[PDB]
Structures are given as C-alpha cells and as structure tokens.
Amino acid sequence: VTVFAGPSRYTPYVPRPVAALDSPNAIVRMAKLVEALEEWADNYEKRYTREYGGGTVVPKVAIGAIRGGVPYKIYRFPELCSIYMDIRLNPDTNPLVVQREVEAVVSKLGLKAEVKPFLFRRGYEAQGIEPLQNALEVAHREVVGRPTERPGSPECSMWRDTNPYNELGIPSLTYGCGGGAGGGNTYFLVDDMLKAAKVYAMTAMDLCNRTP
Amino acid sequence: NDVAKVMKTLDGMREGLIQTAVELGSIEAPTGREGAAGDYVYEWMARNGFGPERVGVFDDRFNVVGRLRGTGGGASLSFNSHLDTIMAREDTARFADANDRIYHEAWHEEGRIYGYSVVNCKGPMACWLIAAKALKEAGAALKGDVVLTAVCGEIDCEPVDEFQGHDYLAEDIGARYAISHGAISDYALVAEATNFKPAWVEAGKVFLK
Ligand SMILES: O=C(O)c1cc([N+](=O)[O-])ccc1O
Ligand SMILES: [Mn+2]
Numbered sequence: 341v342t343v344f345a346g347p348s349r350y351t352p353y354v355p356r357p358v359a360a361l362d363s364p365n366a367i368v369r370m371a372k373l374v375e376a377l378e379e380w381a382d383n384y385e386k387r388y389t390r391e392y393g394g395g396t397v398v399p400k401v402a403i404g405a406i407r408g409g410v411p412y413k414i415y416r417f418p419e420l421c422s423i424y425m426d427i428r429l430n431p432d433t434n435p436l437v438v439q440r441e442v443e444a445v446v447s448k449l450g451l452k453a454e455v456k457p458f459l460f461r462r463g464y465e466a467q468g469i470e471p472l473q474n475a476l477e478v479a480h481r482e483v484v485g486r487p488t489e490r491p492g493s494p495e496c497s498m499w500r501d502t503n504p505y506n507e508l509g510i511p512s513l514t515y516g517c518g519g520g521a522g523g524g525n526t527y528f529l530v531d532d533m534l535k536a537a538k539v540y541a542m543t544a545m546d547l548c549n550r551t552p
Numbered sequence: 553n554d555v556a557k558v559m560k561t562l563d564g565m566r567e568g569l570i571q572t573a574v575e576l577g578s579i580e581a582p583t584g585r586e587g588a589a590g591d592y593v594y595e596w597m598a599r600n601g602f603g604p605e606r607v608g609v610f611d612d613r614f615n616v617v618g619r620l621r622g623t624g625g626g627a628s629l630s631f632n633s634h635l636d637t638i639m640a641r642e643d644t645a646r647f648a649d650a651n652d653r654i655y656h657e658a659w660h661e662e663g664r665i666y667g668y669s670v671v672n673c674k675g676p677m678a679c680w681l682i683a684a685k686a687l688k689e690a691g692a693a694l695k696g697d698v699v700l701t702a703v704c705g706e707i708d709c710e711p712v713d714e715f716q717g718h719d720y721l722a723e724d725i726g727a728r729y730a731i732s733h734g735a736i737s738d739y740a741l742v743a744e745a746t747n748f749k750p751a752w753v754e755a756g757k758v759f760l761k
C-alpha cells in the first residue's frame with residue numbers, strides 16, 4: 341500500500357500547522373492509515389473465520405514492513421510511503437475481494453493510494469483424506485493413547501506445504517509434536533519426538549499396504 | 553569610472569552566461585556523484601586563466617578553488633556555490649516522478665532558464681564565474697584577491713547506520729574542507745538563491761534516529 345502526498349519541500353519550507361490527512365509528508369498520512377487498517381484487521385479475522393472438517397480457519401492480518409524514503413537523505417520528506425501487508429485467506433476467499441476492502445479503507449480517509457498485490461497463493465482443504473486420516477488415527481491412539489483432537493486454529497490458518505500437495509491432488513495433512521514456532525515454542529521434549537517417529541512409522545505400515 | 557567598463561563588458565557576456573549555466577546544469581551531479589561537474593568547472597576556470605586546484609577528500613568528489621589575483625594590499629573576497637544537486641534519478645523513494653525533467657535537465661526557454669539543477673546551484677555559480685571573467689578581461693583594478701570556490705557536498709545528505717563512507721558523505725568533505733585547506737579569504741559571498749535579499753544568519757541542525 342503506497343500512499344501519495346507532496347509536494348516535496350526542503351525542511352525549512354515545510355508548511356505547519358496542517359491536518360494529518362492533509363500533510364505533504366506521506367509518512368504522516370500513512371501513520372493515520374495504519375490505525376484505520378489495524379481496526380479493519382481486527383474485524384477481518386472474525387468476519388472471515390470459517391470452520392472446515394480439517395480445522396477452523398482464523399485468517400489474520402499483519403503489517404510486516406514499512407518504508408519511505410531513504411535514511412541517508414532526510415532533508416526532504418517523502419512524497420510517497422509504502423506499507424506491506426500479510427493477509428491470510430481462508431480457502432474460499434478471492435484475493436480481489438480483500439484488495440477492494442483495503443481500497444475502501446483508504447477511500448474512507450480521502451487518501452490517494454496504490455493498493456498492489458505482489459503475492460497470491462491459495463489455501464486448500466484436503467479431499468479424500470480418510471485413508472491417511474485413519475491410518476494416522478490408528479497409530480496416534482496406540483502411541484499417544486486417546487483419540488486425536490481438533491487442531492488449534494493458528495496451525496490451520498497458516499502456510500504449510502500441505503497446500504501444494506493438496507493443490508496437485510495428493511491428499512495431505514500436517515502432524516507433529518510440540519507447539520508451533522510461530523507461537524513461539526522454542527523446544528521439543530525428546531520423549532515426544534520419539535512418539536512422533538513411532539506414529540510416522542506406524543502410519544506408513546498401514547497406508548503403504550493398501551492397494552490404490 | 554573603471555566600473556562602467558565592466559558593466560558594459562557584462563552586457564556583452566549574456567550568451568556565455570546562458571551557455572555556462574545550461575552546460576553546467578545539464579551535468580548529472582546529485583550529491584555523491586559531483587565529480588563530473590567538478591571537472592567541468594575546473595576546466596572552465598583553467599581556460600579562463602584562474603589557475604584552479606582540485607581540493608578534495610576523494611579523487612571523484614572534490615572542491616575546485618581558483619583565484620583572480622590582486623595587485624596587492626586589499627581585502628580578499630570569496631565567491632561560493634556548490635556543485636551537487638538535489639535529485640538523483642535513483643530517488644524513487646522520495647519523489648513521485650523521479651524521472652521528470654525539471655529534476656535532472658537544464659534548458660533555455662523564453663527568457664528563462666529551467667531546471668532545479670540551475671536554481672540550486674549552477675546557477676548562481678554561473679553568475680559569478682562570468683562576473684569573475686568580466687573583471688579579469690576588462691582589466692579591472694583590484695588590490696585584493698578574488699577567490700573562486702566551487703564546492704562539493706553542500707546538500708544535507710549524511711551517513712547513518714549501514715550507509716557509511718564515500719557514497720553518503722556530504723558537508724564534511726565540502727566547503728569546510730576547502731576552507732581548512734587553503735580557500736581562506738577576508739570575506740566570503742555565498743551565491744545561492746535569495747530574492748536579491750542578503751542573509752547572514754543561518755541555522756544549525758540535529759538529526760535524530
Ligand atoms: O510451522 C510453523 O510454525 C512455521 C512458523 C513460521 N514462522 O513462525 O514464521 C514459518 C513457517 C512455519 O512453518
Ligand atoms: Mn543550495
């Protein structure tokens with residue numbers, strides 16, 4: 341998201357006082373856009389929460405980077421300033437819909453901006469997962485002792501490589517020990533790692549002996 | 553009067569003034585790459601017999617100092633303008649239109665000369681380069697020296713964080729370096745744009761991260 345302003349002025353000529361949204365300094369305007377975008381994000385994750393058999397997807401939003409202009413030439417404030425947003429999608433959300441929502445936040449503030457997508461990947465729920473699901477379930481109850489529980493939302497609402505497999509028709513799930521690093525967990529119990537390796541092996545012995 | 557002779561000399565140099573300003577403003581010279589512009593001014597001063605020297609910290613970013621020597625017994629006057637310009641074609645992060653025209657070129661239209669490179673500062677520099685030429689070539693009587701000081705790095709670029717050294721230095725290697733290394737005189741007129749209004753106070757600055 342690049343917000344435009346201007347005209348550029350050498351610091352001894354900058355007009356003051358001026359309303360934030362009218363500032364010639366694009367950094368100043370962006371700061372106002374950021375709090376509007378944070379509230380939009382607060383409501384986004386709730387509006388687009390969606391439950392699937394494979395888990396509940398809670399799609400979140402973060403502002404991951406900002407810049408404008410360059411640190412080694414600061415005697416003129418920037419005519420532009422960019423923000424970089426990570427916006428997670430549930431499998432059923434079109435990226436263009438999200439872009440218009442953001443274009444609208446900007447429009448409500450009366451700002452001139454460019455909202456440009458530079459990454460798009462689709463999320464998927466597995467189709468025909470039952471054989472792997474079952475093979476794993478059997479192994480899990482043997483090694484861990486109880487039925488499996490429904491996954492925590494953050495671990496359903498990220499990017500993991502189940503997506504490429506699913507996209508290409510290889511039914512796929514994710515499973516391992518410990519809390520996610522995004523959490524952030526910083527360790528594994530050696531005993532749990534051993535448990536997992538056992539589950540992985542058992543899963544293989546079931547599944548790899550079926551005829552396709 | 554020996555003054556009027558110079559004025560009529562200057563009336564005849566309108567064309568060299570224009571040409572010098574345009575040729576000079578046309579040179580790519582944002583802060584950090586003022587070498588080529590320095591070279592032009594050096595060679596200009598040499599042709600006109602001002603005996604120039606390159607005074608600098610780097611061989612491609614330097615100040616140019618030459619003189620119009622006096623008969624003896626007078627006060628020295630410096631004329632000062634800077635060789636660097638504001639916009640680099642690089643700067644897409646500060647300007648909406650980094651590659652306009654007014655940002656990088658310089659041309660004579662109507663009775664004007666256009667280009668940021670001319671207003672700041674190639675510009676007032678052309679004005680006194682010509683003025684110096686008129687005085688010399690009109691054989692004006694001067695007891696004191698006229699010092700011609702063309703500097704690099706006037707504009708407020710400064711190094712910070714990981715941006716260090718040659719590419720980001722400015723004022724530390726500009727005028728104060730020239731003065732500390734010979735370019736001294738009794739008085740100094742800095743030729744930049746006011747509206748024919750003299751100023752002799754200026755501000756300091758502190759940069760905060
Ligand atoms: O699987 C994860 O927890 C995970 C976390 C991050 N991260 O916290 O940036 C990135 C990729 C991951 O797979
Ligand atoms: Mn200047």
